[PDB]
Amino acid sequence: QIDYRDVFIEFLTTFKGNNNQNKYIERINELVAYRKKSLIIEFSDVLSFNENLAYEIINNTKIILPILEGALYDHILQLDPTYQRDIEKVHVRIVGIPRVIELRKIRSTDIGKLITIDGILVKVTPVKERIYKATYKHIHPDCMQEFEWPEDEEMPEVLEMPTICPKCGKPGQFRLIPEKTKLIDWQKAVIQERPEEVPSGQLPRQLEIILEDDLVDSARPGDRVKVTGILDIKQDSPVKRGSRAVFDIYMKVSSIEVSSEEDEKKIKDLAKDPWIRDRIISSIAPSIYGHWELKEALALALFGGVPKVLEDTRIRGDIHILIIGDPGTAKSQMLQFISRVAPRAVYTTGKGSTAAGLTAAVVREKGTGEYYLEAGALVLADGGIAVIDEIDKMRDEDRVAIHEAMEQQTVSIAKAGIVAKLNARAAVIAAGNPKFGRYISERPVSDNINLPPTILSRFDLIFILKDQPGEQDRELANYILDVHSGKSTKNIIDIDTLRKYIAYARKYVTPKITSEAKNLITDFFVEMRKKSSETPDSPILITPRQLEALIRISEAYAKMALKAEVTREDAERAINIMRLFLESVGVDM
Amino acid sequence: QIDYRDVFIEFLTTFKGNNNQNKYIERINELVAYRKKSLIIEFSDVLSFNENLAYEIINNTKIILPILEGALYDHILQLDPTYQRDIEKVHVRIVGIPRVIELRKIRSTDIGKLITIDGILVKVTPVKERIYKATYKHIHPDCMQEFEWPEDEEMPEVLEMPTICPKCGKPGQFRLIPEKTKLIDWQKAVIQERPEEVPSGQLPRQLEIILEDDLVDSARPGDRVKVTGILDIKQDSPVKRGSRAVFDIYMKVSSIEVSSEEDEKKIKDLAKDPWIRDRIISSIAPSIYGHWELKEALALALFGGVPKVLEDTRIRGDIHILIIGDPGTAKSQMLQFISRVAPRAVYTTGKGSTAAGLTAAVVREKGTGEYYLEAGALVLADGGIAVIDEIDKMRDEDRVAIHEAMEQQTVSIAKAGIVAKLNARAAVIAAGNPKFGRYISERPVSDNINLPPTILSRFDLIFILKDQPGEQDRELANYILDVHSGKSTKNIIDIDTLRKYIAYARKYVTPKITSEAKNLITDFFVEMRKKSSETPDSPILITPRQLEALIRISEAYAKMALKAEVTREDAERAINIMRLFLESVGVDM
DNA sequence: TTTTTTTTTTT
Ligand SMILES: [Mg+2]
Ligand SMILES: [Mg+2]
Ligand SMILES: [Zn+2]
Ligand SMILES: [Zn+2]
């Protein structure tokens, strides 16, 4: 019953952070600068500053938030009077609630309590409007009266029309007045539980969440998010009894987090090492022995090149990798690692995917009856990585649907009266087997690969893996047994900080090409084309795409070291890795 | 008539177990300590204690369960006052009801009586909430009153709204208040009669069951269960009568069991025998003569290896077996035995299965038009064994769908805008025929097997069965005729005991590899690779998967004897069995 | 009719 409003202001005005800079007065300082009407607090900070204040938010969230928000609004107005007439209400969001419940473990006892759920966002609906205070007109020739229907209370989830006119006490028919109605932004989304917590032999469960006001459009499908709010039962058709007094539960979102300054200097410290490139390469798939050239190639695809956007056209900045090898060469294990270390990645297989599922699918809503598009794997992976294992198992009639997405990075649809064009700027990493399961050295490369030259030319690098039992078997056997015995390689960058390093590099680093790098690349390309003319039977063609592959690879190498320009050293590395690619496919220079 | 609360409390505090250790008091504090809020009792024990009490439970169940629930709650409160305010109700569940009725024999006379049904779980719905006590607000400008609608009575299965406001006596509008409404967990499941119970020439029947409160998520689809509760008629759509006074029936589950200390003593006693491994192998398919190496191989697949989960990757721990042989070599009979003895197994046929049905199917829900996922055979067999007979009859373009699930133990779907990943950690035992029905010795092994090298490398062991007539025919004929004569081989572990032994071993034994075993395994693998390179024509490739097969087989042998370490003896057995596999496919060692 | 995944008969 004690007044907590005064506790809030002294908390906000007076608080010391880890950096000792009064972190919580700059956020409100920027609150009026951009008029975002939303302030973020941490439960750990509120607990340390006042244990009693923290508890009251947890258990009395229903009837403490409007008072707490109202107190903050008065303080903001005192700081700057111009905030008036721009924002009517200011929301404060609480994160870090210790009450974390798994999606499958929610029971009846959790209804009406503030909880947190971690999951995957799978579906988002367009932003709509919800009525919380309506205005009606009594259509009865004596009344012609206006009145806000829900008195001293907001409109519930179910819309209800008055039966007795409050202005005359008589029944009749009432007409809604949209211009005098108060609205609020409304959005619906579906959260799916992570695959880690799914029990054996069961399908993942889903939960419906509601985003309102400024929380709309705060995430995209495929993101991993943490949502905090209040559970409630969902009402859809209360008018129809139809027996079955059984309801589904939904969650009203109060705050959402999508999966800091100390990381920046940690990343900067790593980039200062002259051998950072070797450290990153050694940190790719530590459980796999050997395959150094493959690990280097996979590292480049994670960073990628610099996309170019011009007045008349744009140039792809992503790097595509194709691996062909004998079974058991650990191709799939490295692809699994890539899908975990990448900040955004989608893992698909050749057999378990279709053309519609990879790019875009036309789905007809049975209720309304109209067609609309559904995002495929490549569209959802925009700005990230797409992994396509067992690419050779795809039907050739179905695999050609990704030809334009791999180069033009767009998906074109002309179906069921829908014409659209969606961006699919995603790097593609694929693996497969030769025509006869294992590579046959007694036959030409033409019949071993069994892939059209059109798709081969779209891959920046192609590595052919051969399982040759030699003198390294003992070393390979010892390494594998050490892994099975729990022994772990040391002096490597762990996956968590490695993911942060890649995300930072792809966002703030844009290398530039210098004059000396141009000459090295130009000379090498001429030799590549000249050497290719010697053997025209090979299904590997040296097209102008190969020249742009060198530019992208060179930029990727500089991006690993966080350099702002491409020097001759980065150009030399790009030539070296390209040379190994050519030797694998049988082109020797 | 009389009150049994004193007897019930006395029975719990005075009953004696098998060792007269009062097997019921130590369950009470376990209920208090974990707040499990559900206690079970045995009907045999109650009958053995007081016959009159058992009859009252078995007959007057609907008027004695609340009475015993209240008596139990009071005894808990005095034992521990902290139990209050956390659990407001504790249910007691009675099992072992003598009233057992087949699913097909249920008639109107059994309605309203406590019965028990044994069947197979097929469908489970997500957990929902059911209202048992509602709260309404009369929307009439004079009332603004809140009240609990169902007075001194639980809310029926049909949602009924008040017609006359009790607080004012007038009709009008009533608004539900979710905050004051009381809810209870609710789940719906479907149970099917056992295949051995279905009459000739008819499809199996199904029954709908309801699980509430703590009984939700008590089992997974495909389980074998025994459900006890009260039968009742189902009221689903009472809005319009439409004549048709005919109703279905459904079961309100009171206690459910799936498929102990005395068993543990029996299991541990078996492991003391030095020849337990030989004794176990002799118990595999006792009705099949010969095929000792096959029975040994099948025994290993039942136990499996030790899966390894690391911070960056995971390693398969399951063992896959492939059998190729001439027709009439008892391949199908042995596979049928594995289905019976395995704690969890799924039997499929190559011709009677599809790619979608084996892994996962995307189907369009008719009511809404939205696509959703259906679990395949491999997903349902997670943590168990998947049996695929006539694998050679599968279409090659369709058989490749299981390549991912056999090594990475995952199922990936990218179809119709659905991207998902599912766990399929199951062991695969497959059988089939050579290319020409019977094995042809003139032709090489490559054209006889007629399988791609990719699928072959996935199998830990491959055995080729040749039906060669010889001097052993007389022994085989005598053995078969004795089986038809009713004679049974003795000194073999019965199937029920063997199933318990395997389940215990797979749950509590995690063998570790010693230094001595590492040296033996490494030497053999190096030797295998050298021999393979000498004859680069066989369809079997010695990939690094073969090295991991040796580790998995070694752990299985140790796990068979409930050993915590892999000594050198287990390594020699693993090497020896692999030698027989290599000689079967014509690879000399 | 229309796109989609699926098992099925029949174009
Ligand atoms: Mg693979
Ligand atoms: Mg057979
Ligand atoms: Zn009026
Ligand atoms: Zn009233």
- Domain A129-183: which topology? Rubrerythrin, domain 2 (2.20.28)
Helix pair A495-508, A261-271: axis angle to 10 deg: 90
Q: Give the residue ranges with Cβ < 7 A from strand C.
A: A 354-357, 360-364, 371, 415-416; B 354-357, 360-364, 371, 415-416
Q: By C-alpha distance, which of B406, B423, B426, B417 is closest to B362?
A: B417
- Integer-rounded Cα radius of gyration of chain A: 30
How many A×B Cβ pairs under 8 Å? 253
Helix pair B495-508, B331-341: axis angle to 10 deg: 70
Q: Do B413 and A352 touch (CB under 8 A)?
A: yes
Token pair 């490695």 is found at A498
Which DSSP category does A363 fall into? E
Q: By C-alpha distance, which of A553, A146, A346 is closest to B412?
A: A346
List Cβ neighbours of B110 (8 Å cut-off, separation of 6 or more): B101, B231
Long-range contact list for A18-27, CB < 8 A, 24+ apart? A19/A261
Token pair 């042989």 is found at B325
Residue type, A248: D
Q: How many CB atoms lie within 10 A of CB A575?
A: 18
Beta-bridged to residue A375, according to DSSP, are A360
A346 SS3 class? strand
CA distance A246 to A234: 10
Q: Do A245 and B130 touch (CB under 8 A)?
A: yes
- A216 φ/ψ angles, rounded to the nearest 5 degrees: -70, 150
Q: Do A473 and B411 touch (CB under 8 A)?
A: no
Long-range contact list for A569-575, CB < 8 A, 24+ apart? A570/A511, A570/A517, A571/A516, A571/A517, A571/A520, A571/A521, A572/A520, A574/A521, A574/A550, A575/A520, A575/A521, A575/A524, A575/A550
Q: Which residues of A touch B544 (CB under 8 A)?
A: 328, 330, 476, 480
Q: Are A225 and A130 in contact (CB under 8 A)?
A: no
Report resolution (Å) to 1 decimal.
2.5
A554 SS3 class? helix
Q: By C-alpha distance, which of A425, A380, A453, A472 is closest to A120?
A: A380
- What method did the depositors use to determine the structure? cryo-EM
Give strand letter and number of the nucleotide nearest A364 (CA to C1'). C3
Q: Are B524 and B550 in contact (CB under 8 A)?
A: yes
Query: Which residues, numbered 332 to 361 in chain B, qualify as contacts with chain A under a Cβ-Cβ cut-off of 8 Å?
Result: 355, 359-360
Helix (H) or strand (E) holding A147: strand A146-148
Domain A4-95 belongs in CATH node 3.30.1640.10: yes
List Cβ neighbours of A63 (8 Å cut-off, separation of 6 or more): none
CA distance B256 to B226: 6
* Vertex B22: Cα angle to B19 and B24 (nearest 5): 125
C-alpha distances (whole Å) from A98 to each of A55, B375, B465 are: 11, 34, 61
Q: How many CB atoms lie within 10 A of CB B512?
A: 15
Q: Is B70 annotated as a binding residue?
A: no
CA distance B27 to B12: 10
List Cβ neighbours of A4 (8 Å cut-off, separation of 6 or more): A53, A56, A64, A67, A68
Q: Are A548 and A497 in contact (CB under 8 A)?
A: no
Q: Are A494 and A442 in contact (CB under 8 A)?
A: no
* Vertex B174: Cα angle to B173 and B175 (nearest 5): 125
Q: How many CB atoms lie within 10 A of CB A201?
A: 22
The gap between A244 CA and C2 C1' (Å) is: 36
CA distance B453 to B403: 12
Q: Which CATH architecture describes the domain B263-585?
A: 3-Layer(aba) Sandwich (3.40)
Q: How many CB atoms lie within 10 A of CB B86?
A: 9
Residues ending a continuous segment of chain B before a break (C–N > 2.5 Å): 259
CA of B185: which chain A residue's CA is closest? A108
Q: Are A287 and B312 in contact (CB under 8 A)?
A: yes
Q: What are the b/e assignments for B181-209, b being 16+ CB within 10 Å?
A: bebbbbbbbbbbbeeeeeeeeeebbebeb
Q: Give percent helix, percent strand, percent coil of chain B, each to the nearest 5.
A: 40, 25, 40
Strand B182-192 and strand B128-133: pairing?
Answer: antiparallel
Domains B4-95 and B129-183 fall in the same CATH topology: no
Give the minimum alpha-carbon distance from B533 to chain A in angstroms, rounded to a whole number.
7
Give the minimum alpha-carbon distance from B333 to chain A in angstroms, rounded to a whole number.
27
A58 SS3 class? helix
- CA B241 vs. chain centroid, Å, equals 41
What separation in Å is there between the alpha carbon of B329 and the centre of ligand 2?
8
Give the minimum alpha-carbon distance from B64 to chain A in angstroms, rounded to a whole number.
26
- CA A407 vs. chain centroid, Å, equals 22
CA distance B464 to B432: 10
B530 inside 8 A of chain A by CB: yes
Token pair 């024999």 is found at B105
CA distance A505 to B389: 52
A432 SS3 class? strand
Dig out the tokens for B554 from the structure. Answer: 């070694």
Q: By C-alpha distance, which of A260, A312, A342, A293 is closest to A464?
A: A293
Beta-bridged to residue B565, according to DSSP, are B512
Q: Which residues of B touch A494 (CB under 8 A)?
A: 311
C-alpha distances (whole Å) from B19 to each of B2, B22, B50, B261, B538 are: 32, 8, 20, 12, 62
Dig out the tokens for B51 from the structure. Answer: 């016959």
Q: What is the 3-state secondary structure (H, E, C) of A154-177?
A: CCCCCCCCCCCCCCCCCCCEEEEC
Strand A246-258 and strand B565-566: pairing?
Answer: unpaired
Query: Which residues, numbered 431 to 470 in chain A, qualify as contacts with chain B under a Cβ-Cβ cut-off of 8 Å?
Result: 433, 436-438, 467-469
Q: Are A545 and A457 in contact (CB under 8 A)?
A: yes
Q: By C-alpha distance, which of A210, A258, A263 is closest to A234?
A: A210
Q: Are A350 and A390 in contact (CB under 8 A)?
A: yes
Dig out the tokens for B482 from the structure. Answer: 């004795």
The ranges assigned to domains in chain A are 4-95, 129-183, 263-585
Q: How many CB atoms lie within 10 A of CB A358?
A: 28
Q: Is A486 annotated as a binding residue?
A: no
CA distance A308 to A510: 11
CA distance B520 to B513: 11
CA distance B321 to A548: 48
Q: What is the 3-state secondary structure (H, E, C) of A191-241?
A: EECCHHHCCCCCCCCEEEEEEEHHHCCCCCCCCEEEEEEEEEEECCCCCCC
Give the minimum alpha-carbon distance from B185 to chain A in angstroms, rounded to a whole number.
6
CA distance A532 to A541: 7
B184 inside 8 A of chain A by CB: yes
Dig out the tokens for A500 from the structure. Answer: 């942060």
- B285 φ/ψ angles, rounded to the nearest 5 degrees: 50, 70
Which DSSP category does B104 fall into? G
CA distance B421 to A194: 10
Q: What is the DSSP string of A369-422?
A: --EEEEE-HHHHTTTSEEEEESGGGS-HHHHGGGHHHHHT-EEEEEETTEEEEE
Q: Are A568 and A277 in contact (CB under 8 A)?
A: no
| Alpha-helical regions (H) of B327-437 | 331-341, 355-358, 377-380, 396-399, 403-407
The gap between A400 CA and C1 C1' (Å) is: 27
Dig out the tokens for A200 from the structure. Answer: 């054996």
Q: What is the DSSP string of B542-581?
A: --HHHHHHHHHHHHHHHHHTT-SEE-HHHHHHHHHHHHHH
Tell me the CB-side half-sphere exposure of residue A213, using CA atoms within 13 A.
17
Residue type, A125: T
Dig out the tokens for A38 from the structure. Answer: 């939303």
Q: What is the DSSP string of B396-417?
A: HHHHGGGHHHHHT-EEEEEETT
Residue type, B4: Y
CA of A479: which chain B residue's CA is closest? B522
Which DSSP category does A540 fall into? -
Q: Which residues of B touch A390 (CB under 8 A)?
A: 400, 403-404
CA distance B93 to B110: 20
Helix pair B568-584, B544-560: axis angle to 10 deg: 130
* Vertex A215: Cα angle to A210 and A220 (nearest 5): 85
CA distance A577 to A579: 5
Helix (H) or strand (E) holding B349: strand B345-349
